Each structure stands twice: as structure tokens, then as C-alpha cells.
Amino acid sequence: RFLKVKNWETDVVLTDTLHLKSTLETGCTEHICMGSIMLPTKDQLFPLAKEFLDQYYSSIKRFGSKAHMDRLEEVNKEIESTSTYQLKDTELIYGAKHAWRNASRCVGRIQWSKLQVFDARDCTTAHGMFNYICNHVKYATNKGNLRSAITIFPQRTDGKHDFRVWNSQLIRYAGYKQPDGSTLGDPANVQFTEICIQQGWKAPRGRFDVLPLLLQANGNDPELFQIPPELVLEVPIRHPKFDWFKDLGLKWYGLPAVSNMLLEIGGLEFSACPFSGWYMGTEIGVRDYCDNSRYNILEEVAKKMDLDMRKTSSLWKDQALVEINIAVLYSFQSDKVTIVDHHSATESFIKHMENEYRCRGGCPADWVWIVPPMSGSITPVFHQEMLNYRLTPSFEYQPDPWNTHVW
Amino acid sequence: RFLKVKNWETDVVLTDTLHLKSTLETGCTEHICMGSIMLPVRTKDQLFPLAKEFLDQYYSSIKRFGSKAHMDRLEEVNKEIESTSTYQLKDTELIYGAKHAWRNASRCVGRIQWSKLQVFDARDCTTAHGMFNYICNHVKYATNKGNLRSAITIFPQRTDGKHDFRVWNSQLIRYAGYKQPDGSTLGDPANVQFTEICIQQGWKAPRGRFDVLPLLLQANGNDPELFQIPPELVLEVPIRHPKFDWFKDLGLKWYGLPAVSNMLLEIGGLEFSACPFSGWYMGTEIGVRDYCDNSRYNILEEVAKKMDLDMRKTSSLWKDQALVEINIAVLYSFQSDKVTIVDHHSATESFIKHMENEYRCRGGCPADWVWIVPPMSGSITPVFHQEMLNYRLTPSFEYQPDPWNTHVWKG
Numbered sequence A: 001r002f003l004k005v006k007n008w009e010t011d012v013v014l015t016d017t018l019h020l021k022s023t024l025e026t027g028c029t030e031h032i033c034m035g036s037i038m039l040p041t042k043d044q045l046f047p048l049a050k051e052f053l054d055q056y057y058s059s060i061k062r063f064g065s066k067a068h069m070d071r072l073e074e075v076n077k078e079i080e081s082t083s084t085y086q087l088k089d090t091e092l093i094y095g096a097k098h099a100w101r102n103a104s105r106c107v108g109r110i111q112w113s114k115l116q117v118f119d120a121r122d123c124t125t126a127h128g129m130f131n132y133i134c135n136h137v138k139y140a141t142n143k144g145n146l147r148s149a150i151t152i153f154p155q156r157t158d159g160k161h162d163f164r165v166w167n168s169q170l171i172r173y174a175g176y177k178q179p180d181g182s183t184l185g186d187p188a189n190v191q192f193t194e195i196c197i198q199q200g201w202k203a204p205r206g207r208f209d210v211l212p213l214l215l216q217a218n219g220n221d222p223e224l225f226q227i228p229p230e231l232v233l234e235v236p237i238r239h240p241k242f243d244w245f246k247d248l249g250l251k252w253y254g255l256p257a258v259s260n261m262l263l264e265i266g267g268l269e270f271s272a273c274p275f276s277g278w279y280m281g282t283e284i285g286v287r288d289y290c291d292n293s294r295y296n297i298l299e300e301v302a303k304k305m306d307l308d309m310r311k312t313s314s315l316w317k318d319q320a321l322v323e324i325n326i327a328v329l330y331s332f333q334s335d336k337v338t339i340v341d342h343h344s345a346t347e348s349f350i351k352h353m354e355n356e357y358r359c360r361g362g363c364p365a366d367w368v369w370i371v372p373p374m375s376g377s378i379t380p381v382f383h384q385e386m387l388n389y390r391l392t393p394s395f396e397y398q399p400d401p402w403n404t405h406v407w
Numbered sequence B: 001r002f003l004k005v006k007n008w009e010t011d012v013v014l015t016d017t018l019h020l021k022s023t024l025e026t027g028c029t030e031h032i033c034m035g036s037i038m039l040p041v042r043t044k045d046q047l048f049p050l051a052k053e054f055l056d057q058y059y060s061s062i063k064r065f066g067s068k069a070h071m072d073r074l075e076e077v078n079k080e081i082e083s084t085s086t087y088q089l090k091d092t093e094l095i096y097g098a099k100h101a102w103r104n105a106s107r108c109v110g111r112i113q114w115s116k117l118q119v120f121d122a123r124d125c126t127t128a129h130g131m132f133n134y135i136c137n138h139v140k141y142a143t144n145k146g147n148l149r150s151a152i153t154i155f156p157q158r159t160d161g162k163h164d165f166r167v168w169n170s171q172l173i174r175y176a177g178y179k180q181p182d183g184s185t186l187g188d189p190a191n192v193q194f195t196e197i198c199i200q201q202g203w204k205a206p207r208g209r210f211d212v213l214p215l216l217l218q219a220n221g222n223d224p225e226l227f228q229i230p231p232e233l234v235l236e237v238p239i240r241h242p243k244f245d246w247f248k249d250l251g252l253k254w255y256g257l258p259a260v261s262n263m264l265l266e267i268g269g270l271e272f273s274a275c276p277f278s279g280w281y282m283g284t285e286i287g288v289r290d291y292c293d294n295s296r297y298n299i300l301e302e303v304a305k306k307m308d309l310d311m312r313k314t315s316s317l318w319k320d321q322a323l324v325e326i327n328i329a330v331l332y333s334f335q336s337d338k339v340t341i342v343d344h345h346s347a348t349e350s351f352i353k354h355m356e357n358e359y360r361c362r363g364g365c366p367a368d369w370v371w372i373v374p375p376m377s378g379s380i381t382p383v384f385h386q387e388m389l390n391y392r393l394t395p396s397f398e399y400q401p402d403p404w405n406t407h408v409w410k411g
């Protein structure tokens, strides 16, 4: 019931008590560990509300005050009468910051308290959502000096009136099946590109087409909008020594903005809540460029470097991988777009972990996601034991809406 | 209950039923995952079920379940347990059991080979000098002049827990570590404690960077005794790089035979607390961890210096660049001297084939993702993209406390 985590590089031992406030379920049992699996009424709502308000008032040091008791009463009345309730601005801001604080898969949480929250609960239409999103994008991009942000659309009501951003990120490249048999662009986005085209998008059928937004307001059919091109900051990829690297024609976008998740605060569900930070280099260089199922560029880069590809043991994949990641970091830095390398990011998160153990008594962390997808053991997180558990407020996955939406 | 695991690169979905046969617990609950935690005297009453369970598995494996020979062996073990409170494995059951502990080892990426294990039965051993002889034979057989062969040597099982056989070394061959008065370490810092014990026991330490430790051996619960492995039996590889001629002047070498000697083998309820086993290396074990961990030989700085990398900013990825070159050097060196080694691409690809085959033939393959994925270049290996289920099957290899913490000294 009191848990120890050891760092095997420093022998530093931390005690976790925070997990005893864990609410949701991990997917594991005492017989089976599922730690590597990607996706493991009025009655229910009031304990959820109480639980959240109790943590809020405790956080502002007014636990058990008349203002605490009165708000609990007020929310209680509002649920009994309206079957839902409304968060105050202060509660909304706190809930969002804490959903990020609690995000066990995010290595960037040292920044959690600096989140800029945009309250879009007054939004009613898809055009309104489009306006709010462009403002988020411009505010967060900030001409390269990226700032964390979240934009929060109206909460779920009866689930017939859901706000959804159909895109998985605000900014992504299209993917196209070809006559050829191969795939043009980002293969991760093929099906959603199909949803766009069949809703009316004119696709330019290129390698790096920024997808249009597909926005659903109040449970209505979603609508298309193109993000103003001038708000989509992109970086051409060059290498500081390989002059030929630019010839690959590679680019990426500056703003990582996950848009398909659901924010749960005090039992309330915010199904459209796009949020954004800034990239750790490996995300693009290792995953987006090198996954066999993504742009899968390792072979081409290796060929240009004139490496011996005859045998896996020459570590040619590994050599090319490093150089690709050097090029990503270099290119963002040259153009002054915020980016973090995996050494600096993991080092930060270790400091965040210690802070959180000292000030909060724990920090839920999914080791499988936190350890970078290259050079794992030369980053300190590799040697850090982590406990994974589910605290609320939280960001949760949710079904893709085209599987659900009734047209 | 069927459990599905998905590969996110290939969209292959597999179905696990094997997990239903799981007995032991993981450390995880519905409320907490401890998947990254390194480490999360029996009764007659508890012994016969474990015996029975194991022998039902044995007799099923050989297609003789419910045979007269199966029933007779149950009755005989039952009677032996009641009369003597323990029981002896037949040779065949011991072989089968040891193979299966390997097969069930969820942190082992080398399991495609599980069926080819050479088992040396050392249950007639009575003394530390006897153990030493068994261990030299194992090292020489397994080395095979660089063409490595998997092997396990099995010493007598636990009885009352007061007469345990133990190998006090953590591997049969490992380098000494010496803490210096200035706080620096010479040699391998992982082995400082065990080295200090060896010196206290009377080993004359050469005190260099790569001194092969003496075997420290406990038989039948007695105080352990020191033995030097004959040097001619210790195959080592000097490390050089195919393109960088200064690489050899770092003075690096490593030993070719990895042989874990500190784990406990459980078969049918019985505890074999000395069962050293050995295979061959995957290159990253040496080039990533043994060489580049901060708490091990820690050579990354010195290497990147010699490479003239830009070291002022981590964002040049100098560490990642040096790491690759060291790993190329390790693999090149072993291959040039014809010592068995496997690269991390080749090993993980093999494991993925092994895992699929295991699902089809056995209904599962317990695997620990945290351990299986290599400590460099994770996502360009297919295992990174493979969902896995971790659970504990018997027979199994288990951790056990270090013997110097529990041993009752006789003097």
C-alpha cells in the first residue's frame, strides 16, 4: 500500500502514496500484465463531482470551508435538477492542468502548470469551432516560440449532441492509396483522408498535404474547413553536414496538437478538447519518418549515405536513424521552432518526477511510452522504475466518431 | 477467456489462451501496473499439487497423459513425498523441466532456441571442489572454441533450506570492480560488492580493468570456497572497429560466454538454487549496457572525444552517434574472431517469429516488453511494435536473495 520505485543508475528510491487515490482501472490483473497494450446517470455523476471539488478546494487550501460546502451543495442541486452541472472557470482551468499533470504517457509534464486554457464552452457551430481552432493554432505556434495550450468545447449532454474534432491532430498530412499499390503521403491518415474526400475535400494528392479540419458541433454532421496556410508553420529538413539531405524533399509541421481525445473533469466529458505542446525530436525523426508503416524512409537515407546494407550487423539502420534525427533537431533549431531532444526531455521528466514525489507523493508514468524509441538506456528514464495508474481529471481515448456518428 | 495482442506495424492480431495456465502473481493489480519494476522450506501439502501439475504437463508433452506410466509415476511421487517429504526428478523430467523454464522466461529474447538446451545433471555433486569441476566442464562445453552452445548445469535441489548449493557469482565469468580511495572505480562497478567478498575470502586481486573473477562456491550449505577458472577456458574478445583504428587503443575486451549463475530454477515444486545456464550475447548487452551505462564502464565520453563529435550540446546527438559506433565495434570484433553473437535486429526478428509460432502451437508466449525491446534503436526493431502479455508459468527461473545476505557462517 506504500510503494517504492528505484532508479538503478542513481540508487535513488522514491515512495509512492499517490496511487491510493487511483480511480480508474489499469487493464492489468495479478495474473497478467498488460503494460504494453496500446488500448487495454445522476447516480454516478455526483460522487464524481464531489471527488473533483474536494481536490480543488484542498488545492486552494479551503478544504471543508463554507465556500467548499456551498459549492458542493450548489452542484448537488444542479445535478438533481438539470442532471448535469457547469464548472466555474477556475475549476475548468484546474481540471485541464491536472488532466495533463495526470497524463502518464507524457514526458513533457514538467510544464504542466503553464498550460494556457481557452474556454470555448460558448461555441455552437462548426464555423465557431473553426475560429477557435485557428486562434489556438496561432497562439500556440507564436511564430516558432511555441506555447502549450488547450481549447475546450461544450461538454457532452445526452451524447446525441457531442462536439468532436474528427482529425487525430489539428495538423497532419494526407495519406492516399495508389493504383501503384504503394502509399503516397502519411499511411497513418489514409482512412481519415478517405472521410475528407468523400465529404467533399479536393485533395492535391501530394506527399505533404495538410489535411482540412473536419468539425462536428452539437452532434451535427461534421463540416470541412482548411486551416489558413499562413498559420501552419512547417520546417524543411536539412542535415548540417549532408548537403544531399535536402533532396529527399522532407518537411514536418511545428505544432503537435492532439485533437481526438476526451477530457474528463469531475465526471463531466469534453469530447472536443484539442491540446498542443511542442515536439521531442524522436517523435518525427524516429517514429514519423522511420516506422515501416509511416514514411519509412530508412532505406533511402541509408542508400544516400553509401552504407553496407547487405547485413543487419553493420548497424546501417541504426546509423541512418541517428543522422535523420540529427537533421530534424538541426532544422527546427535553425528555423527557431521550439523542439526538444530526447536527452533533454527525459532529464527534465526525471526532475519533474522527483518534484512530484516530494510535493504530491507520486507521479503516474507509463515506462513503455516515456522511454524514447531510440537510445533508450542512454536516457535516464530507462533506469527509472515507474508506477502506472489512472488519476482523474484525465485525458482518455475515445472511439473514432465515423464509427459512431449517425449521419 | 481469449486475450488478443496486436502488432501495430503489421496489424497481425494473436490470441492468448496460455495465460489461463498461469499460477504465480505479477505485482500488478487492476489499479496499478508494476510492469517496469525490476523485482516486484516447503510443506508436503503444498508440494504434491505442484508435483502433480508438473507431471500432468510432462506426461501431456510426451502424449502419455493418463497412461499407466503416468498414473504409476504420480503414485510413486506421492509416496516419496509422504515418506521423505520431498522427491527426486527423473532425468527426463529434469531435462524437460529446464527446457521449459527457458521457454517460460518472459524477459528472454533468445527463446527461439529453447528446445536445444544441453542439460548437465549435477545432482550427484557434494562438494565445492565438485561444483568447480562441473562448472569448468560447462564453460568448456558451452564455449566450444567460439561456436557457442546453450547449456545449463543443475546441482542438487533444496532440502531443508540449511543445505543449499549456491554459486555466489552472479555470472560464471564477469570482471572485478574495485572502489578506489578517491571514489573512482577500476573495472566493472556492478561487481564491486562481490569482488570485495572475494578479497575478504582471500582472492589475490590483480587490480586491473578486466580481471576475471574467481568462482565462489557453496555446496550442501557449507561456507563457500574460491576457485580460479583456468584462463585457457575463458574465451575473450579484444574490441576493435572496422574503420576506426584508434578504437583498439581504448583497451577494451569482453568475455564471449554469458552465463547467469545466481537464479533459482523451480520444477514441480522443487528448488534448484544453483543452476548456472548460458547462451550467447546479443551485441547491445555489451555495447549499450556493459560499456555505456553510467554505472558500468561508462565509455561514451572517451569515445565521442576520439570521434571529435560536437559535445557542447546534447542536441547534436553525440551520445547516440558514439553509441552506434561502439555497438558496430562489438559486433565486428566477435564476428572477426568467430565468436557467436547476434545483433539486435536479427535477434528481435527471430523472437517475433518464435512468438507467433508459440501462439499457434502453444496458445501463448509470455513476454516482458520492458526487457525484450533493445536498449538502443527500440522502434526500428519489430518488438517495439508488438503488444505482449506478461505472466508467470512454471517451470521457471526466479530471482533469489544474494547468498551473503542470508548465509549462516560456520567459520
Ligand code: HEM
Binding pocket: A099, A100, A103, A105, A106, A107, A108, A109, A111, A115, A148, A149, A150, A258, A275, A276, A277, A278, A279, A280, A283, A340, A345, A369, A395
Ligand atoms: C509542452 C511540451 C510537451 C512535450 C515536450 C510533450 C511530450 C510528449 C510525448 C513525446 C508524448 C508521446 C507522444 C507519442 O508517442 O505519440 C506525449 C504524449 C502525450 N501528452 Fe505530452 N507533451 C507536451 C505537452 C502536452 C500537453 C500541453 C498536454 C495536455 C494538455 C499533453 C498530454 C499528453 C497526452 C494525453 C499524451 C498521450 C497521447 C496519446 O496517448 O496519444 N502533452 N507527450
Ligand code: HEM
Binding pocket: B098, B102, B105, B107, B108, B109, B110, B111, B113, B117, B150, B151, B152, B260, B277, B278, B279, B280, B281, B282, B285, B342, B347, B371, B397
Ligand atoms: C541462446 C542464446 C540466448 C540469447 C541470445 C539470449 C538473450 C537474452 C537477453 C538479451 C537477455 C536480457 C539480459 C539482460 O538485460 O541482462 C536475456 C535474459 C534472460 N535469459 Fe536469455 N538468451 C539466451 C539463452 C538463454 C538460456 C540458455 C537461458 C536459460 C536456459 C536463458 C534465460 C534467460 C533468463 C531467465 C533471462 C532474464 C535474466 C534476468 O532476469 O536477469 N537465456 N536473454
Ligand SMILES: C[C@H](O)[C@H](O)[C@H]1CNc2nc(N)[nH]c(=O)c2N1
Binding pocket: A036, A037, A038, A368, A369, A370, B008, B384, B385, B386, B387, B388
Ligand atoms: C506495442 C507498444 O505498446 C507500442 O508500440 C508503443 C510502445 N511505446 C510507445 N511510446 C510512445 N511514446 N509512443 C508510441 O506510439 C508507443 N507505441
Ligand SMILES: C[C@H](O)[C@H](O)[C@H]1CNc2nc(N)[nH]c(=O)c2N1
Binding pocket: A008, A382, A383, A384, A385, A386, B035, B036, B037, B038, B370, B371, B372
Ligand atoms: C527500471 C527498468 O525496468 C530497468 O532499467 C530495466 C529496463 N529494461 C531492461 N531490459 C533489459 N533487457 N535488461 C535490463 O537490465 C533492463 N533494465
Ligand SMILES: CCSCC(=N)NCCC[C@H](N)C(=O)O
Binding pocket: A106, A108, A256, A257, A258, A275, A276, A277, A278, A279, A280, A283, A284, A287, A288
Ligand atoms: C499534444 C500533446 S503531447 C505533445 C507532443 N510532443 N507530441 C504529441 C503527439 C505527436 C505525435 N507523436 C507526432 O509525432 O506527430
Ligand SMILES: CCSCC(=N)NCCC[C@H](N)C(=O)O
Binding pocket: B110, B171, B258, B259, B260, B277, B278, B279, B280, B281, B282, B285, B286, B289, B290
Ligand atoms: C545466460 C542466459 S541469457 C543469455 C544472454 N544473452 N544474456 C544473459 C545476461 C548477460 C548480461 N546482460 C551481460 O551483459 O553480461
Ligand SMILES: [Zn+2]
Binding pocket: A028, A032, A033, A034, A035, B028, B032, B033, B034, B035
Ligand atoms: Zn502491469
